Symmetry: none
């Protein structure tokens, strides 16, 4: 929860959930749970953008 | 499917603000929203210890 | 153009372009140009469905 | 981005009805629509011989 990468991902997913599909998804280039979650947010962003 | 995406972004905000008991919705979907929900749930479990 | 798998993919992509995201994309399980095109139509279908 | 998807479905209908000269739109996009357009264009070329 408590670390900065987590809060930053939460901010990024709030922007995508409000329809801002251009903002860059941080913290992808890692293999732990933070990186798995970041890559999922990124794939969802790309799908929502192709649909718009 | 904005409703489930908004629900899951609100739940991740609760976990990121230190509520590690938050129930994570939509884990059973067989699409990217259910993969994201599963990953939020795995992160939540890992933080709890 | 002229073969049945091609016409069938064209029908399937017409349905997805009209918003019918449930119909099954045929001809994916092959490696030639027909199968590459079918798998692309399928990935687009899945993205449009997650966005809806 | 329904407009480009409708455009590319209409172009694929022209090729599937035997117009192998049809210009295929949207090949330069860097997303799934541009991958689909590229694959329609590759199929069109392959049919022409």
């Amino acid at each position: 929860t408590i670390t900065r990468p987590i809060i930053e991902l939460s901010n990024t997913f709030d922007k995508i959930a409000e329809g801002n599909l251009e903002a860059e998804v941080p913290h992808q280039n890692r293999a732990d749970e933070i990186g798995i979650l970041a890559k999922s947010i990124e794939r969802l962003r790309r799908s929502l953008k192709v649909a718009m």
